[PDB]
């Protein structure tokens, strides 16, 4: 249309940034909880057909052995952000021989957001914002940390953040169940309780993903047997 990508609304809003924020509400619901024992990441696969293999829907991605990311919105757009995160990490390791902090990893991915333009831009520069919200979760010097990223490039640490279609409903339920001093098992259980209530389908060990990053331990993808153990309760 007549409007460019880098255009400001009369209310001070970047039009394309706000529009990309609306794209997250069409994505699957992802729940991340920060706990002193670790960070739990939950997301719904949203199976649309019995023939589709649930294993192919990877909505929780290993950024590194100590940090994982949960995605919501446009999954195809998050691959570029994830690849840069997995490239920025192992670049800090190459130069400083240490694992990058979760805040720094989120900050590096955040700088990729808003680097979109129509004119006076590089040939490889993007044209539109990344219509995906990321939920970075991992352990570092500051212990377990959960960070939420939005298509606006604004990243902030969150004790318990829910993103996606049911972000409004799940966040309200998260506040009713989150306390600072709890265990990771409660955080995993509470996330599955909230997810089960917001999913269109019925919760089972094949239509969801659960990830935990514990201190000492590495990023871990919950298997079907592990998922069935916690689902069998609620």
């Amino acid at each position: 249309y007549d409007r460019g990508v880098n255009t400001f609304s009369p209310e001070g809003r970047l039009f394309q940034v706000e529009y990309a924020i609306e794209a997250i509400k069409l994505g699957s619901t992802a729940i991340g909880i920060q706990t002193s024992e670790g960070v739990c990441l939950a997301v719904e696969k949203r199976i649309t057909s019995p023939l589709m293999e649930p294993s192919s829907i990877e909505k929780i991605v290993e950024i590194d052995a100590h940090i994982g990311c949960a995605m919501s919105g446009l999954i195809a757009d998050a691959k570029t952000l994830i690849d840069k995160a997995r490239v920025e990490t192992q670049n800090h390791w190459f130069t400083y021989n240490e694992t990058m902090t979760v805040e720094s990893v989120t900050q590096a991915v955040s700088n990729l957001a808003l680097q979109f333009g129509e004119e006076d831009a590089d040939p490889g520069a993007m044209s539109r914002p990344f219509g995906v919200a990321l939920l970075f979760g991992g352990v570092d010097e500051k212990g377990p940390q959960l960070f939420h990223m939005d298509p606006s490039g604004t990243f902030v640490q969150c004790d318990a953040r829910a993103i996606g279609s049911a972000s409004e409903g799940a966040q309200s339920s998260l506040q009713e169940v989150y306390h600072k001093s709890m265990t990771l098992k409660e955080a995993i259980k509470s996330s599955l309780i909230i997810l089960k209530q917001v999913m269109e389908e019925k919760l089972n060990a094949t239509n969801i993903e659960l990830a935990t990053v514990q201190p000492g331990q590495n990023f871990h993808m919950f298997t079907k047997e592990e998922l069935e153990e916690v689902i069998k309760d609620i």
Partner: protein, 237 residues
């Protein structure tokens, strides 16, 4: 309209609406107060939290050993500007082995921000900066606008409901010069209180203070470190 879709279109009234639209992004941001004395220049910021389960967005960023800023507006644009001023301050040390003067830095970001407001398809930096620094010329408080126009201010407040703080700063601007560090910070906290609603109060969670002085490096204070400043001021009437 047809004059508000691009930054290179002059309105018939001699105005650029995209520049003014970007200026409203600062007004959407949270209030920050920057004031200075004969020997100190402090920044007081009111961090905002999207939800009570999320942390308060950082508002004061360290640029150089003697220069510190408080952002207001698009966080991504602030990082782009803050990185630029960090690099320019670093480049002065690498070349001249001297701190970059604050007046000579805001000119650079006033020209860096002016280029996008004049070329087709570019947008103004939707962030407002309150720059505090100390150099040979004394403490400074610079306010940066998305219009690429900067002001050398005795005491300025930008953000949402910042004009309530501008009133308090104007009323007590006379006693800013001779007051010590503790009184200077309290004035900014008192000014930042005017931007809050009646029921809200200054707490350690939503207050950040940055101090740069003659013999003091620029240091940012947080929830634990705001307590030595917050307890002094009395409750507002």
């Amino acid at each position: 309209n047809q004059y508000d879709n691009d930054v290179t279109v002059w309105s018939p009234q001699g105005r650029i609406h995209q520049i003014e639209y970007a200026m409203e992004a600062v007004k959407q941001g949270s209030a920050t107060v920057g004031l200075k004395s004969k020997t100190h220049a402090v920044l007081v910021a009111l961090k905002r939290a999207q939800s009570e389960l999320a942390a308060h967005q950082k508002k004061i960023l360290h640029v150089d050993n003697h220069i510190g800023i408080s952002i207001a507006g698009l966080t991504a644009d602030a990082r782009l500007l803050c990185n630029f001023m960090r690099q320019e301050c670093l480049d002065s040390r690498f070349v001249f082995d001297r701190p970059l003067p604050v007046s000579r830095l805001v000119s650079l970001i006033g020209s860096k921000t002016q280029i996008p407001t004049q070329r087709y398809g570019r947008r103004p930096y939707g962030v407002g900066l309150l720059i505090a620094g100390y150099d040979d010329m004394g403490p400074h408080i610079f306010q940066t606008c998305p219009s690429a126009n900067y002001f050398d201010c005795r005491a300025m407040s930008i953000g949402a409901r910042s004009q309530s703080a501008r009133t308090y700063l104007e009323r007590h601007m006379s006693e800013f010069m001779e007051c010590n560090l503790n009184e200077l910070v309290k004035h900014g906290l008192r000014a930042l209180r005017e931007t809050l609603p009646a029921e809200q109060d200054l707490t350690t969670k939503n207050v950040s203070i940055g101090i740069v002085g003659k013999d003091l490096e620029f240091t940012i204070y947080d929830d634990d470190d705001v307590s030595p400043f917050l307890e002094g001021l009395e409750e507002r009437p």
